[PDB]
Paper text:
Samples of OXA-10, treated with tazobactam or tazobactam in combination with BME (with full conversion to the respective −18- and +60-Da species verified by SPE-MS) were crystallized. Three high-resolution structures with two molecules in the asymmetric unit (ASU) were obtained, each using similar crystallization conditions. Evidence for cross-linking was observed in both OXA-10 chains. In chain A, clear and continuous electron density for both the Lal cross-link 10 and some unreacted carbamylated lysine was observed. The quality of the electron density map was overall less clear in chain B, though the mFo-DFc polder OMIT map indicates partial cross-linking. However, no clear density for the remaining carbamylated lysine was apparent in chain B, which was therefore not included in the final model. By contrast, with the D(2S)-stereochemistry observed on BME addition to Dha 9, the new chiral center formed by reaction of Lys70 with Dha 9 has, at least predominantly, the L(2S)-stereochemistry. The combined SPE-MS (including derivatization trials with BME), LC-MS/MS, and crystallographic results imply initial formation of a Dha residue 9, which reacts with Nε-amine of a Lys side chain to give the cross-linked Lal species 10. To date Lal 10 has rarely been identified in natural protein structures under biological conditions, with the spirochaete flagella hook protein being a notable example, and it has not previously been described with a β-lactamase. From the inhibition perspective, the Dha 9 and Lal cross-linked 10 species (which cannot be directly distinguished by intact protein MS) are of particular interest as they are the only modifications we observed leading to apparently irreversible inactivation of both class A and D SBLs.
Author numbering:
A (entry chain A): 21 to 265
B (entry chain B): 19 to 264
The structure:
């Protein structure tokens, strides 16, 4: 059950953002959102796909262990931040595409399809190129599906060892306070094309006292200058709900 | 673990605050440690709350703790700190240093199993005399800063005599700072203000993951007044900041 919450519209209006926030307390049984329709609309996952990709890499042994170092071969990569040896956490934090492209190639299309089916990950469409289906392909997932997937990860209920789920969760910690703990991941497909904007994401969960909140945000984006809104709008809302800050 | 050297240059941060203490910092790649005081780095002190690291692992290994989602229910009876009068997750109990929670865990573990695991973990002087629910607070258990970084390195590598899953559970509970460049796991300790000419001890121990490097650290200091407690984090933080780790 998904319920609409008009109070959050102001945080989108202020910035002229077309997007959706989904927030679920305790579980995905009851989620609130500003837009029922968009909450379930499916978009390219972009970098949010690093989460299942890392779990699958570990499950298949492609990622040998949580202390795996992904070495840089010295060839040019799109960002200087990617031109170095990286740990799993490091590659997730700087969204090092080529590391995850190689993981996906070594996983291969058969195993990748199997695990996305097991994870109920979006439309599970990996066709068109095994190293780019989540970047420019036909794979799509909704904000509602992201919170279901993240809840499963939080509960160690995905079709993967508890160890591997714990390894990926540690790699996703983005804020640690005495009061609460934030696991999150951003994504950005790009600026899109004429009359067809890209998508920007922020998904994760907040552990606070004995409660947990799952969240997923996405928005239309046609200019990189708008990227900070993918964190600030959901942060504003969760602040106004008394969850963080 | 492989070598240790004395670094006089860190004494600056201790003298500035009139602190008698030690910092041990070890770089995992080079298997090399540095400290401001080799003698104090080997002196053994009550672990106090730093003992919540082994105690939680042992609690999980023995099944006394079910998993990271176990909620430690408050029975409603008063507690010294007001922060303890609520339900707590494992991370919550570790983060607020909830003494009664871990006293009950130690009782359920029992002396025989507690002794066995501290032997397996090579944890300090392995003396748990003094009562099963207070040996680490006011009994005879002592551990040095060098021993602390040896133990934390084992945990980081999942090389303690415990399941990898249980070591991972305790590690996630120990995360205290997450930045895009680095991740900090840490734990504080404080035994009390001590007695005339016999101060208590305050601790800060943990590790830092940065780029492909790992830094293990252990800090302790004499403390005779609660107002000095913030120095157990500020002195090591300033040292690690000056080393470029932050
Ligand atoms: Na590249």
């Amino acid at each position: 059950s998904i319920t609409e919450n008009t109070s959050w519209n102001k945080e989108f209006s202020a910035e002229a953002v077309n997007g959706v926030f989904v927030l679920c307390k305790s579980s995905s049984k009851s989620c609130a959102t500003n837009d029922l329709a968009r909450a379930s609309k499916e978009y390219l996952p972009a970098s949010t796909f690093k989460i299942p990709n890392a779990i699958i890499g570990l499950e298949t042994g492609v990622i040998k262990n949580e202390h795996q170092v992904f070495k840089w071969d010295g060839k040019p990569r799109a960002m200087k931040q990617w031109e170095r040896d990286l740990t799993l956490r490091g590659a997730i934090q700087v969204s090092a595409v080529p590391v995850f492209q190689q993981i996906a190639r070594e996983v291969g299309e058969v195993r990748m399809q199997k695990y996305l089916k097991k994870f109920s990950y979006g439309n599970q469409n990996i066709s068109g190129g095994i190293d780019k289906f989540w970047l420019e392909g036909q794979l799509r997932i909704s904000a509602v599906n992201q919170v279901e997937f993240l809840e499963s990860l939080y509960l160690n209920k995905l079709s993967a060892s508890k160890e591997n789920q714990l390894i990926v969760k540690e790699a996703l910690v983005t804020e640690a306070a005495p009061e609460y703990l934030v696991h999150s991941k951003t994504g950005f497909s790009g600026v899109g094309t004429e009359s067809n904007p890209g998508v920007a994401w922020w998904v994760g969960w907040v552990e606070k006292e004995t409660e947990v909140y799952f969240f997923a945000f996405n928005m239309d984006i046609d200019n990189e200058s708008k990227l900070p809104l993918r964190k600030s709008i959901p942060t504003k809302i969760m602040e106004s709900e008394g969850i963080i800050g």
